[PDB]
Design a protein around this ligand. Structure first.
Ligand SMILES: COc1ccc(CC(C(=O)O)C(=O)O)cc1OC
Ligand SMILES: COc1ccc(CC(C(=O)O)C(=O)O)cc1OC
Ligand SMILES: COc1ccc(CC(C(=O)O)C(=O)O)cc1OC
Ligand SMILES: COc1ccc(CC(C(=O)O)C(=O)O)cc1OC
Lengths: 330, 330, 330, 327
């Protein structure tokens, strides 16, 4: 054959990938995650898994055709979870998503039932992986994925409020004329309607905005910074109303988390984890607090010092999640 | 105001961006171009333009929400082309897109009409820009943009066979077990069924595949390497059939061209340009040849030495194209 | 000619660089700046200037030889400043450096003499440039560069405490087991012995470490965090003692600042600027405060809220610097 | 403790670790290039001068905010190199002004007798990337001392020579080196072989446009481009005392292919017995497919009778030198 005329093989090709990533779900979110991960050079192998055969193969092919411009030498796909074997990171984006006017919390029954199939198949073929849950409601589904998988909780991470916080920082930067990277602010709790803007931590260069404007974030605020958090709460719905779904921002947020995990960076992100034992929470609620994220997932949790109102709001968010979570069967 | 309590302003700045890129059309291809350009840090401003107000705004907001994870500090959009002012590079992806089974040539009058609106407005707000045409049929539409714009030919560029050649190199790499970066081969002429694979230039490490197999690419070829070119030609149709459109590979391909232009790299790409004076072409025909691409667009063309067959294909591939443009309604 | 047989020139047009950076001085610091800038793809042209012709040509050549692995297509050098023409950023690293036991402030009369030649020659050819001063004492020398050039203050920047704060954050990171990216804290004032750690701003995820231990940074601190600031102050001298000079950290710090400028990011950095008007400083003192940095240099200054002790230490640094400024002879 | 007031700990070993042996200019250029390409989750430095080594490590560590490599470590003790995927050897005598690289061989063989077993002890499954000169001989020596299979012992070889050739070609043609193709093979030194037959832009053979290409009869004396390739290190040594930046970038390129399993083709030094007519345990540069298991495959270039004689000449030296070494 021409190959053997051109190339003498010197080594029997027993290839196993060292930095493999799998994306489960090839909808808009799953593919935004995939392109973002490919463009950040995080993986030596990318696997895609979903249940619509043609769509799956099409997306795989489309990515493959860009290989010249990438540094991820193997892209593969299958309905069959065997294709995901040996992953270091598996990103779960499959399941129903909310219609306009529908809460993420309304997806729980559908997505728990889908997780009962997906999670055991993932763990079967990728015993060393971290699980990164993106599907909604992400906080509850991280709990569900954790219980189903048999993984210790450090290895099951919800994309959580990493996106809400990035949205908050974008909006804040726009108001201040400063890059989001230098505008610090944390949105914690549910990735959803009950998220908590932590005004007391909002700062540029370590200067607290609340110390300059004590009314910051209340209705008494002349500049109505509370509308920043409302915009954050509403952003999924506003973008769904305009383009039908959201994809790019969540894709970049997931890639950001994947980078911290794959590169063992130990950066702090607001992501879904067990918060039992903090702020008086007694049940296995998962929600976003600032977490140290590295090669073994979430190794540490930062204990944010919240105002009485912030803490009340965070407890109220835990309560809302528990209200849905305690009724689940799986 | 809180901003003024926090920040003392030194000057009212000259706000003209220095590395602005505009993407016209926020369909799947336009957005894939957008996200790829964002992830390659090519621009200090990205502007989006299209005619569907909500979709446009939705896409802009979604990109904006990822700003924390990017290094492109201003992302803007409008149906009004004034938002595109001072672009170094304007990428046109707007217009009708190819349905399943539909040929690119079938898009030609619809898109020539769309270009009568688009191109003058682009030229109005960025008279010094380079135009990068992606919409199909890309060869004919690059000609149309050139005639309408009044720009010198160096600044009107078609994405042409850049992706086709990328696909060839991927498929070649899959056959040889080599990364496509190290697999070389050129697909030239019309971006479509009449493209030409230049068998003589197909090589790895300067070793010509044709010298190892003199029947390479011909019907007597035992490994039927011509099927690699058939796959190249059929790729977009196969992918459209599977997922409804193509996006990722063309997006990456365009970002690669954007990179050469914006960073003045003077890499050689097979892209659509005015080849009158070459291969016995005496009309104002645009098609892909290897072009040196930098900050003034296409400054130079590589003269590929074609076999008599390869060159006959090209002068035909030409007339296939020039038949149509001779009689265009604009 | 072979070039003419292979390539048809289609365009005579004068290449004028769009993103040029000049590095003045090709000692260890200058070359660390150059390689870092090259590896961050910040420039379409790099110019080097120094006074020793062989060393200059050798360094230029060595960088040139790595061009295949870079995306900066023109690397040039000369002892003549005409080579620097049309730079957007000019980085000044030439001058004497301190010995062990010697203060950076002892370099002032030598480096003012050098600056009286270098500065007028730099500004002559680059009307759009920002001047980024790295040579020591950097704060004083930014004042000198500003006086000699007659540039407005936004355009004359000293690398200042960008490195000192990077070191602070590294050492804080080490203590806390968190990446320095997530460890926030500001060292302001002189890049030297009189620098000021802003304990009140030191935080992770918005949580003030001083709020948790109000003794943080004082002599009553059980954990002696003041030693972290002492390590920052002593870092150049410790490294000089071990390897003879410092290069890598300052090179990365300068490239960080070049990135904000070249990409108009508007990130906040602790860099040397004119602080007359702030903290009741009444003289044209330059020193590090958090500055918003972009394509027009420093457009805005963050007014950090300092404790009375922190403010007194910053005024003390300002006094020290003013005292040396009063020794300057133009 | 402040840390505990701030952080609740829940969990109490690197996956992509690279070691650079030698913190001379070459080693540190490799180190900075590897750091700026985000190739490693841990970088270890090893050398014999303890102060210089600590100073370099610290200087790198202070830039950590600006990097994505979260652990940088150093020691004279090779235990610091444990769990390396890739170990890059840059230590030894360096080429001196006006002297062949072959003048370093005995001294660097001696150094390798100490270095290589220590590397092998702590990372028995690493890929070894030899950079020290003369790189072809020392890659052979590393292979013999380590006992590794030949795929995992790689010499930087002519990777930079070919990068220089493409730079020079590019300057002549007004084209980026990424688009100018051409291979320098054989010994990394004065007897390297420019393969004129493969020199091309966009698949267009330069020889086809100028049949005399690379010969004495060449009107444009393209052989001078190879002469400049051969002379490059000597000229830069003359001017600045050593070379560092281009080699660091070349090494980081090879590290990239290995660490990311790219299977790109590089002209690097490999055990070429059986291939290209050679019968002894000799290493020299040919185009190799490079990935996570080192060199898995070699491209067979159709060489002219000359290119083949030279490569047998360029070759024959090395075995004569290697037969006389003992370890
Ligand atoms: C699995 O589907 C999704 C998961 C998360 C998002 C992100 C989205 C959300 O959480 O609804 C957002 O906040 O933009 C979008 C999805 O589908 C479009
Ligand atoms: C704007 O529409 C398109 C332009 C180019 C491509 C790329 C396509 C082609 O050029 O036919 C391909 O090769 O995938 C696809 C488009 O719509 C999906
Ligand atoms: C131009 O000389 C220098 C400027 C700054 C530094 C940085 C250095 C210092 O300020 O002494 C440091 O803090 O590491 C080092 C230089 O020469 C080695
Ligand atoms: C460790 O010694 C070296 C190894 C390679 C180079 C690179 C050099 C060469 O290979 O001769 C070159 O080509 O620049 C330089 C060295 O010392 C400075």
């Amino acid at each position: 054959a021409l190959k053997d005329q051109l190339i003498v093989n010197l080594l029997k090709e027993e290839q196993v990938p060292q930095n493999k990533i799998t994306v489960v779900g090839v909808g808009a979110v799953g593919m935004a995650c995939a392109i973002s991960i490919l463009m950040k050079d995080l993986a030596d192998e990318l696997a895609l898994v979903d249940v619509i055969e043609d769509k799956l193969k099409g997306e795989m092919m489309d990515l493959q055709h860009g290989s010249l411009f990438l540094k991820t030498p193997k892209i593969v796909s299958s309905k069959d979870y065997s294709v995901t074997a040996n992953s270091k990171l598996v990103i779960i984006t499959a399941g129903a998503r909310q219609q306009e006017g529908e809460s993420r919390l309304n997806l729980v029954q559908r997505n728990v039932n889908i997780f009962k199939f997906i999670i055991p198949n993932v763990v079967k073929y990728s015993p060393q992986c971290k699980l990164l849950i993106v599907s909604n409601p992400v906080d509850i589904l991280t709990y569900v994925a954790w219980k189903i998988s048999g993984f210790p909780k450090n290895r099951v991470i919800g994309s959580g409020c990493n996106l809400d916080s990035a949205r908050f920082r974008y909006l804040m930067g726009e108001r201040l004329g400063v890059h989001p990277l230098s505008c610090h602010g944390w949105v914690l709790g549910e990735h959803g309607d009950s998220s908590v803007p932590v005004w007391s931590g909002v700062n540029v260069a370590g200067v607290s905005l609340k110390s300059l404007n004590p009314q910051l974030g209340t209705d008494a605020d002349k500049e109505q910074w509370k509308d920043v958090h409302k915009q954050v709460v509403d952003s999924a719905y506003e973008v769904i109303k305009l383009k039908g779904y959201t994809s790019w921002a969540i894709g970049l947020s997931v890639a950001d988390l994947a980078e911290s995990i794959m590169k063992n960076l130990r950066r702090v992100h607001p992501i879904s984890t067990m918060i039992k034992g903090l702020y008086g929470i007694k049940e296995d609620v998962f929600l976003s607090v600032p977490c140290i994220l590295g090669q073994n997932g979430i190794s540490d949790v930062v204990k944010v010092t919240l105002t009485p109102d912030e803490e009340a709001r965070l407890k109220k968010s835990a309560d809302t999640l528990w209200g849905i979570q305690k009724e689940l069967q799986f």
